[PDB]
């Protein structure tokens, strides 16, 4: 069970396009931090496809911080040439993504589950990650 | 009333002496 | 005119307004006229102001009632459900805290009715 969706209560109009904001994000609110690699707009999908394996691969349980949010689904006019409307609407939501931008910060489980946590999370995607430290908190 | 007391139209169809049936 | 919490009665003879009140036991009445004599044969309208007054506070002060009648109302019933009386599952269930018959008339606490149905092919007598 659990088949819903998630995206700003309702709409928020449907329009935007892109950049690169060559990365961003600060210290942290949690422990063993998850640091990104690649710069792009992300899919609800790729997200889920990660915490998954981790979690159950986190039997008794798991846990990690989840920094970001949804912003704009997308277009992609299904077939033919190209004019108006906004297909690809309720199709796929993207979160704002900066190069190396932070994404998460584990706990409870040390570099036994926490190590791989990131080393499998990243794997789940094309890009990869590293741990936390201090920086400032 | 018919089914009502404190008079006679009831004390009759019921059977109840009380302060309403002695004499002196 | 206020022998108690707003005594609206006014527009006749004592033998006209009187006990049509709420907490009303005609007894003390023949006492306003017994112990004293504030008779009945006096048209409220002119109900001698002397009578008027002495009668007013007559049963206004000291004499608890009307509102206090409501008092016990709760005590009896309410005191029964705050406790463990069966008659308690009566008043508190729209059941007439009187203890009489069964399946024959409700119009005591709750009232009227809502129906359901009957065994498919259920007759009448």
């Amino acid at each position: 069970m659990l088949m819903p969706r998630r995206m700003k209560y309702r709409k928020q109009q449907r329009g935007r396009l892109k950049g690169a904001t060559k990365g961003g994000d600060y210290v942290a609110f949690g422990d063993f931090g998850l640091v990104a690699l690649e710069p792009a707009w992300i899919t609800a999908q790729q997200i889920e496809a990660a915490r998954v394996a981790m979690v159950r691969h986190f039997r008794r349980g798991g846990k990690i911080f989840i920094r970001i949010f949804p912003d704009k689904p997308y277009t992609k006019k299904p077939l033919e040439v190209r004019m108006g409307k906004g297909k690809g609407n309720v199709e796929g939501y993207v979160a704002v993504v900066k190069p190396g931008r932070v994404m998460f910060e584990v706990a409870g489980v040390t570099e036994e589950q926490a190590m791989e946590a990131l080393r499998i999370a990243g794997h789940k995607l094309p890009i990869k990650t590293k741990i936390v430290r201090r920086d400032a908190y | 009333g018919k089914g009502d007391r404190r008079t006679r139209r009831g004390k009759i169809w019921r059977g109840t002496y009380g302060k309403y049936r002695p004499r002196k | 005119a206020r022998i108690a919490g707003v005594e609206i009665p006014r527009n006749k003879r004592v033998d006209v307004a009187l006990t049509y009140i709420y907490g009303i036991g005609k007894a003390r009445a023949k006492e306003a006229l017994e112990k004293t004599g504030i008779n009945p044969a006096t048209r409220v309208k002119d109900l001698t102001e002397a009578e008027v007054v002495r009668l007013r506070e007559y049963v206004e002060n000291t004499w608890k009632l009307e509102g206090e009648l409501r008092a016990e109302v709760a005590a009896n019933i309410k005191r029964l459900m705050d406790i463990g009386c069966y008659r308690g599952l009566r008043h508190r269930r729209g059941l007439p805290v009187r203890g009489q018959r069964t399946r024959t008339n409700a119009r005591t606490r709750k009232g009227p009715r809502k129906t359901v149905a009957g065994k498919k092919k259920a007759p009448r007598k």
């Binding site: - | - | 206020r2 707003v6 509102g67």
Partner: protein
Amino acid sequence: LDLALKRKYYEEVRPELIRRFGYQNVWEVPRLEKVVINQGLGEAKEDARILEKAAQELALITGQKPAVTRAKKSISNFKLRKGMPIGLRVTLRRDRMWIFLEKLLNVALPRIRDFRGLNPNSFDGRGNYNLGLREQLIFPEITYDMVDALRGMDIAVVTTAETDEEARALLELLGFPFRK
């Protein structure tokens, strides 16, 4: 006039306050502020005239002609389409609110719909208080009066009353008991 409240508070309330608490400045003690009077119903253009029937008796009943507040629009309105008036109002600080109330209080009050109790708890937390209502003839000068009439009403009050501390203070001062 020169009766109750007058040589009352102004010769008696003061000489009490004194030790019956530690006060300082005069114009900064359990003084006073204003006497507020207001009313509302729920009906509008029932014919538009009945509305003025109240308009008739009421105001003058107290002994004062106030300002009006009737109508808003022939709209649905959630709590009734009623044209949408509200009621009326006015206030005072002169001896109109002096002897006027002396009577309505020691008199109209106790002839209440259930004596042996007073509401000194419908308090706010300062010189702000409120008590609704629904009577008429209970008034001293207006005993009975206008059966053909009939309706509800309400009142508000204002004083320094750092809190109902100065409020209730007036309470027992000259009546105004505690509901118990």
